[PDB]
Point group: C3
Chain length 62, copies 3
C-alpha cells in the first residue's frame, strides 16, 4: 500500500530472485543424469512460484 510497504515488497522480490539466480549460476557450473537434478528442480520451481507471488503482490499494491 504505502511507499515503505512497497519498498519492502520489492526487496523481498529481489531477495527471492537472488536465490534463483544463485541456483542458475550453480547449475551452469555443474554443466561445465536427470535424477541428480531433482533437488535443483524442486528449488528452482519453488523460488519461481515464490517470486510470482511477490510480483503479483507488488502489482496489486501498484
Amino acid at each position: 500500500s504505502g511507499i515503505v510497504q512497497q519498498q519492502n515488497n520489492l526487496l523481498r522480490a529481489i531477495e527471492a530472485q537472488q536465490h534463483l539466480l544463485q541456483l542458475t549460476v550453480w547449475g551452469i557450473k555443474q554443466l561445465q543424469g536427470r535424477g541428480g537434478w531433482m533437488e535443483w528442480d524442486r528449488e528452482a520451481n519453488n523460488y519461481t512460484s515464490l517470486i510470482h507471488s511477490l510480483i503479483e503482490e507488488s502489482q496489486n499494491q501498484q
Copy 2:
C-alpha cells in the same frame, strides 16, 4: 521522477528480469543443435534489451 513513478519503474525492471530468469532456468533444464535455440536466443536478447531500457530509465529518474 517521483517516488511512486520510480517504484513502478523498479517493479517493471524486476518483472522483466524474472522473464529472463525463467528463460535461463528453462535453458538449464534443457541442458540436463544451435538452430533449436533460435527462439530462446531471440527472447533472451529481447528481454536483455528491455531490462537495459528499464534500468537506464530508472537511473535517469535518479
Copy 3:
C-alpha cells in the same frame, strides 16, 4: 535510511543482478574444459558477493 536512499539501493541491487543474469545467459549460450571458465567464475562470484552486500545493506535500511 530514507525512501530515496532505499530506492537507490534497490536500483543498484537490480543493476548488479542484471550483470549476473547476463553472465548466465552468456554461459548457457556457450553450453549450447573448466580452465576456459576461469574468468566467468571470477565474475559470477564477484557479482554474487556484490549483490549480497547490496541486499544486506537494503535489509539494514529496512
